[PDB]
């Protein structure tokens, strides 16, 4: 009988892998672009004193295109408690829908499956995937993930593709910072209770809805805690050219006169967008 | 959102592995073949191209089978011996992969493909088809 | 001056009159059929439309055949009593005229046509091919 | 270098620092070239305990 203004909610988003992907904006819902397959060979080291030449072999230029997929939903009320409420469901629901759009879009753009969802780069499975060796312990051949791998992985990016960031669930980064050498000293941040370098300078954008190999942060691995070989760990790609995210129209909300039967006021919302994988040579995946 | 693209570039059969079917190309003004394999080949497979004429009796049935001549474009050095058009599906062409060729100069009103002699053994595993481009009625 | 219209809208056989075929439609974004009869029909024939899914044993071979649901737009009133999309070539289609059509919503990776029961002895006189549109990858 | 029994060949970091600073001094400046992977095969080297 002393109703407060407190609205403890206690729910989380992810980070967003959206400012990484190259952005493009389209008005029509069907765009088309060109691609250079290969320049091909032109001209050989011919001999001298040969009044002739060779036609070589011409290149190839493909012409691709891709759609934009839409995302819509509906939510209604009763119009009776909406008049006596000590709150505003509508402004809450409007926010409670955009939150569903932002998290569904980013997730789909990663793991979307073909039809009527942009094909994410995970399921596309054309990024070359690098899998790590297992280790020995008391004769057993448990799979593992040593700091030696992470440096080998990040550095093995072809230098001419450009500068490329890395993405991984923060529990992997927690796994890295806490490795110990033979004696017991830490590997990173020797003797300061915590290792936390400026990620931006080490080119590691961090997220929380990637496959997260350390299952709920409970599979470091010595016995039955092995990483369950075949799990995603981290990815690395020159994102501004490896993957594009298209945008057509931001979300809208429109009352639906008709269907509202004088009890149930029924709102409608939707938005249109899409994405597609560009040249999937810039980009690699690390795996257990 | 997919478009009913059968009108505006329809497609017809031309060799189902056992019989050629003439396809009328008069009402349209561009066309091409899209080969496709159904099982691994044994060696190179060669196909002849034929064009027909409106039959002498009935003007909407194809006439006989005349072999279409072939033309070069500067860079021809193969120059098929008898100057008659032909297409050679190269060996080691896997399934789930299609090759697409087209004769440059159109003549007649029905075109057809047929397995060249000496190559009709492993030609039952190919299936050519045609797709026209742009009605001109 | 006709173009190699094969690439950029290729086509494949989907029903040669004796057995069906699955055609992959992942690499493309829009597609449609082009029916064509070879001999006069005797009654209205009906075909069922099926979509496949990537098999678990190998993601480059289609799995079992599921039947695509039916989507009404606004004008639809027949609804085909089953909620399972199907085509029906009407009677009196002379075998020198094609008919085009396509489903409004694809799903899966593959698509297939087969004659519905009752009209299996007339479908031996028809041909159904699929031509796609722009390639996504 | 010897492994358990056999004689698998290898290439250690010590084998690189010994090669570079073994160039006849009176030849002028001398640089060196290598495939990117080889450089990424000296970065990820471990001593006895765990240290890079």
């Amino acid at each position: 009988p002393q109703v407060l203004a407190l609205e403890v909610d206690c729910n989380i988003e992810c980070a967003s892998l959206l400012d990484l992907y190259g952005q493009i904006e389209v008005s029509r819902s069907t765009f088309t672009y060109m691609k250079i397959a290969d320049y091909g060979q032109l001209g050989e080291y011919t001999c001298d004193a040969k009044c002739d030449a060779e036609f070589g072999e011409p290149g190839n230029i493909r012409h691709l295109e891709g759609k934009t997929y839409d995302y819509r939903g509906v939510f209604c009320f009763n119009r009776k408690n909406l008049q006596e409420a000590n709150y505003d469901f509508l402004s809450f629901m409007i926010g409670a829908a955009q939150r569903s759009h932002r998290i569904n879009r980013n997730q789909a753009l990663m793991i979307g499956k073909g039809v009527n969802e942009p094909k994410g780069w995970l399921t596309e499975n054309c990024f070359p995937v690098f899998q790590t060796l297992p280790v020995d312990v008391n004769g057993t051949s448990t799979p593992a993930f040593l700091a030696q791998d992470w440096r080998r992985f990040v550095t093995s990016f072809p230098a001419e593709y450009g500068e490329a960031r890395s993405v991984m669930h923060q529990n992997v980064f927690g796994y890295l910072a806490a490795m110990v050498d033979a004696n017991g000293r830490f590997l990173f941040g020797d003797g300061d209770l915590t290792f936390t370098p400026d990620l931006v300078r080490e080119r590691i954008r961090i997220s929380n809805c990637l496959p997260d190999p350390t299952e709920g942060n409970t599979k470091g691995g010595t016995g039955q805690d092995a990483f369950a070989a075949g799990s995603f760990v981290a990815a690395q790609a020159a994102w501004k050219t490896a993957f594009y995210a298209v945008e057509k129209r931001p979300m809208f909300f429109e009352q639906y006169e008709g269907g509202s039967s004088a009890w149930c006021v029924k709102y409608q919302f939707g938005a249109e967008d899409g994405g597609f994988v560009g040249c999937c040579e810039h980009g690699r995946i690390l795996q257990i | 959102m997919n478009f009913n693209v059968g009108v505006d570039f329809p497609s017809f059969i031309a060799w189902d592995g056992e019989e050629s079917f003439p396809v009328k190309v008069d009402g349209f003004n561009q066309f091409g073949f899209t080969f496709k394999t159904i099982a691994a080949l044994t060696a190179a497979t060669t196909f002849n191209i034929f064009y027909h004429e409106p039959s002498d009796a009935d003007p909407c049935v194809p006439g006989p089978a005349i072999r279409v001549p072939e033309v070069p474009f500067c860079d021809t050095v193969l120059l098929s011996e008898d100057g008659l058009a032909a297409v050679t599906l190269p060996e080691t062409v896997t399934p789930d992969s299609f090759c697409a060729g087209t004769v440059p100069c159109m003549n007649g009103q029905w075109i057809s493909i047929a397995p060249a002699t000496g190559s009709e053994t492993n030609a039952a595993n190919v299936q050519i088809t045609v797709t026209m481009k742009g009605a001109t009625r | 001056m006709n173009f190699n219209v094969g690439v950029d809208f290729p086509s494949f056989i989907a029903w040669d009159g004796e057995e069906s075929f699955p055609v992959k439609v992942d690499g493309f974004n829009q597609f449609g059929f082009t029916f064509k009869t070879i001999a006069a029909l005797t009654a209205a024939t009906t075909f069922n439309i099926f979509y496949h899914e990537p098999s678990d044993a190998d993601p480059c071979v289609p799995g079992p055949a599921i039947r695509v649901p039916e989507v009404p737009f606004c004008d639809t009133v027949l609804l085909s009593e089953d909620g399972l999309a199907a085509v029906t070539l009407p009677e009196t289609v002379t075998p020198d005229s094609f008919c085009a059509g396509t489903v409004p919503c694809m799903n899966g990776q593959w698509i297939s046509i087969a004659p519905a029961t009752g009209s299996e002895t007339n479908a031996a006189n028809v041909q159904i091919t699929v031509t796609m549109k722009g390639a996504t990858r | 270098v010897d492994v358990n029994g056999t004689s698998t060949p290898a290439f250690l970091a010590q084998d690189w620092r010994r090669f570079v600073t073994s160039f006849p001094a009176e030849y002028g400046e001398a640089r060196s070239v290598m495939h990117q992977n080889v450089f990424g095969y000296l970065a990820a080297m471990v001593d006895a305990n765990g240290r890079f």
């Binding site: 190839n60 499975n125 054309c126 070359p128 995937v129 690098f130 899998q131 790590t132 060796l133 040593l146 030696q148 791998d149 080998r152 992985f153 093995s156 690390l286 | 080969f35 191209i49 072939e70 033309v71 070069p72 474009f73 021809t76 193969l78 098929s80 058009a85 297409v87 599906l89 190269p90 062409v93 896997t94 789930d96 992969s97 299609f98 090759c99 697409a100 060729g101 087209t102 004769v103 440059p104 | 190699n4 690439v7 992959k24 992942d26 690499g27 993601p59 480059c60 990858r137 | 270098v1 010897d2 492994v3 290898a10 250690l12 095969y41 000296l42 990820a44 080297m45 471990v46 001593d47 006895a48």
Partner: peptide, 28 residues
């Protein structure tokens, strides 16, 4: 004179191990 230009339909994955320099071992 016809010229063909085919291209695959389904891609294949690309797995490869990531062996790293071995445990330092003395040559004696």
């Amino acid at each position: 004179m016809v010229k063909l230009n085919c291209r695959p339909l389904c891609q294949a994955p690309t797995a490869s191990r990531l062996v790293s320099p071995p445990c330092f071992i003395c040559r004696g």
